[PDB]
Amino acid sequence: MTEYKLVVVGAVGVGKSALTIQLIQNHFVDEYDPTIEDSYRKQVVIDGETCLLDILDTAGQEEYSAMRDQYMRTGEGFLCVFAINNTKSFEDIHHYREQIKRVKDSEDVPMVLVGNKPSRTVDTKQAQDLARSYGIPFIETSAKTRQGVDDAFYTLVREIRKHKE
Amino acid sequence: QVQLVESGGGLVQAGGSLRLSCAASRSSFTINRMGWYRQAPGKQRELVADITSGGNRNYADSVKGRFTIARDNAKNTAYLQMNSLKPEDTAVYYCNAKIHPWSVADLWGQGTQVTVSSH
Amino acid sequence: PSADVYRFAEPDSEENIIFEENGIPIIKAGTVIKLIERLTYHMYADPNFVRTFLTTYRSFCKPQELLSLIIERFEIPEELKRFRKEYIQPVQLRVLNVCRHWVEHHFYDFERDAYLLQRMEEFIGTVRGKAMKKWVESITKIIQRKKIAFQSSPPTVEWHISRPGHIETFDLLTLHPIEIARQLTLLESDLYRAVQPSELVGSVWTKEDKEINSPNLLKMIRHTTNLTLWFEKCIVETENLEERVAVVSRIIEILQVFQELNNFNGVLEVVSAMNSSPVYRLDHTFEQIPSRQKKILEEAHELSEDHYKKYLAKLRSINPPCVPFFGIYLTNILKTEEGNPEVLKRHGKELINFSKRRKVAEITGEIQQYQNQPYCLRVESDIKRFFENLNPMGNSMEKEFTDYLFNKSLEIEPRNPKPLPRFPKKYSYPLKSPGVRPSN
């Protein structure tokens, strides 16, 4: 079956890990063990096609800033995550995207902008406009209620498919 | 677990042309270097041409001016346009991939017979 | 035992304590009252729980609160001869053992909160048991001490072009590659061994106070980052192709010795630089690297593939001394804490989820296992100082500097079809390496 190598990127504390864990967990099981393969690889069906998602989430290593190229180079598509209560994490997005394009030596890399849900300081319209300027989808999530989590990863899988076609 | 699938090849008259094609099956990122090697009866396997994802190429002296290699980075596919073929070009031709610029491990295709017949 | 004027005597039920089902019972969850009861249980000793509780409790109980609860645990209200012998005496001893472990192994709680220590000293002054005089004196001695602040012959230091003492000529190609690797391994081993569990539990290196709560960890990560960036800068600032090839080759030889020393932090410092956008794209440079050195870099990079699968196996297979790559522990601690609930609920009651704390303590325990054994290698003060003072970014911010490196890459090997310029040499001395075989 087809495997998709996804990489999650973004500033510290924006919910990269909660998104990844909420995607991988079966819905009503609340016990995560990050030391095993089933914690980052998941078989799903998307638009009728069954595939294997391999998610690289390096949350907690943000201070190793010279390793980002190494981690990004492993990926086919990128979830660029910011926290909607954290304006600086939204301002960082441009730099992550430029680093990814440089690593992939390409102007159109499959990518989705994710704004994950204190109170709101980044307007939905601002994030939609930023995503539009990049030519990529924007998705808001609430890792805590699980709202939008599947949509964010499946939309990235769709972007990867559109790119390969 | 990347696999290289070759197509093209076979029998052709001396003076004629063939295009070999190579497509990598299951890869997450651009293969650093794709190329073709060939092995004639009695000889070692030798480079024919290769090309990096940055477009830098090498050609064997014996095919320069006759053979052209090209690739599509986004697709991890490559092709070899072989013109003005000579009986000395008869060989098994192999697609080759080096994943990284420091790669020494080879990924090989299964090998494609090319037989160039004369008059 | 006692009636319920002693909160710890309430009977176990599914709504105050849960055990792991997969020697000693292992607690999966409990009210803080039940956790402290089992921490000081009358029926058996539990040194592993004492260790993991005192390592992790601050995520669910404040230090002042813990002291209040253990004093409450100790002050048991009263066959009564049987009760004293089989319940009061063993619980009280267990409490004193927790106090001793606390002041001996987690004295930072008292350094950060002087009133916590006053309360502890006041409590210990109340314990009069003739039996418990030895515990009393032992605890007092530790407190008084805390309030006050080569197995085998090492091999010969190796030298290349730079001679002993000529600090001002020290550089990547002029020091000996064996000795660069040795001295970076001593520096990185020291940085690794300095990281304490208090810098990790609660994921505090990711929070706003990270600079005060995780200084040794952050110092360690900043060294790794600076060395990776120095390798990149040495490569791309060497404009002449043959010189650059010699620089990349020498870094791979330093990598070979890092591997021989089981310094995986150093292995990754090199792997990360070679994966970086300014270095990875240098087709003309990598083309000239000897195949046997390509193979060394190839095997090192492969340790990182598939979520560090080969790295994890190799670490488990070698014998210390070693320097682990810390970033894996950081992600696993963070995901363990974020991916498991803080509390479990049972018939409406909240229980502290202790199993995820135990899992974090198992990670900090593995970190500690590798911190025991030092390297049998001799420090060289000038070389150590040279590396402690490396600052490849200069005065620049991260973005400006990484843009500089990439633009330098594009200058020294322009994109196709632009032609490859030739560039003048910069190194006056010979480029030939002495190799990485030691002398004797």
Author numbering:
A (entry chain R): 1 to 117, 121 to 168
B (entry chain C000): 1 to 119
C (entry chain S): 570 to 591, 597 to 652, 673 to 743, 754 to 1044
Question: Could you share sentences copied from the article?
Answer:
RAS GTPases (H-, K-, and N-RAS) control many cellular processes by switching between an inactive GDP-bound state and an active GTP-bound state and represent the most frequently mutated oncoprotein family in human cancers. In this study, we exploited the unique properties of Nbs either to disrupt or to stabilize the SOS1cat•KRASG12V signaling complex (further referred to as SOS1•RAS) to modulate the nucleotide exchange rate of KRAS. The SOS1-catalyzed nucleotide exchange reaction is a complex multi-step process involving the binding of RAS•GDP to the catalytic site of SOS1 (KD1 = k−1/k1), followed by the release of GDP to yield a nucleotide-free SOS1•RAS complex (KD2 = k2/k−2).
Similar to the inhibitory Nb77, Nb14 interacts with the Cdc25 domain of SOS1, but Nb14 adopts an orientation that does not cause any steric hindrance for the binding of RAS to the catalytic site. Rather than blocking the protein-protein interaction, Nb14 stabilizes the interaction and accelerates SOS1-catalyzed nucleotide exchange at least 27-fold. Indeed, Nb14 and RASY64A decelerate the formation of the ternary complex (k1) to the same extent (~12–16x), while Nb22 accelerates its formation (~4x). The binding of Nb14 or the allosteric RASY64A further accelerates nucleotide exchange by stabilizing the same ‘open’ conformation of the SOS1•RAS complex, in which nucleotides can diffuse in and out with less steric barriers. Consistent with this notion, Nb14 has been affinity-matured by multiple immunizations with the nucleotide free binary complex.
